[PDB]
Amino acid sequence: VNSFSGYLKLTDNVYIKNADIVEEAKKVKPTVVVNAANVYLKHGGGVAGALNKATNNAMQVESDDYIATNGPLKVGGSCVLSGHNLAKHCLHVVGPNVNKGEDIQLLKSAYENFNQHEVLLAPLLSAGIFGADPIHSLRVCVDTVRTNVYLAVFDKNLYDKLVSSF
Known part of the structure; x- marks a missing residue:
């Protein structure tokens, strides 16, 4: 378990790799894989959809059961669920969606x-459809975690740009 190889060290505690997180999870067998989730844990696309597909929808069934008890997650919040075949645990984390005008400060809470x-093993939070600058997101990760x-x-273009910022 936690067989991480081929990562570039950015800080004492933060590593980066140009890699498919699902492919990495299958290879690393990490204790925890982080999901870039929405408040409803509806794993319909992006990293969430890829992770869920790799579990053949087990992640989605378990998430639905969790939401049935908890209701929606809060922005900046998370829950620990099974990592199924990808990890021991999946940490589902909701970063702010700046497209909805959610405060970027909630990205610190998220990390x-x-x-x-x-x-x-994690992706960058609040990038892509959540609209945060991914370099900013890596800065918050490095300052917070x-x-x-x-x-x-x-x-790889994004990876090159992030690495070029350290």
Whole structure:
């Protein structure tokens, strides 16, 4: 388990790799994989859809059961559920959607959830459809997370740009 290889060290605790997070999760068998979730844990696209498809919808069934007890997650909030075949645990984290005018400060709250886990495989939060600058998101991760975080970035152009910022 936690067989991370081929990562570039950015800080004492933050690593980055140009990788498909699902492919990495299958290879690393991490204790925790982070999902970039919405408040309803509807895993319909992006990283969430890829992770859920890799579990053959087990993640979605379990998420639905969780939401049935909890109701929607709060922006900046998270929940710990099964990682199924991808990890021991999946940390589902909701970053702000700045397209809805949600405060970018809630991205710190979002990354603060990582501090409850000694090692995580994660994507960058609040990028793509959540509209945050991904370089800004990596800055918040680096400033906020004190446990060991291994970031997978799929897009090589984005990866090059992030690495070029350290």
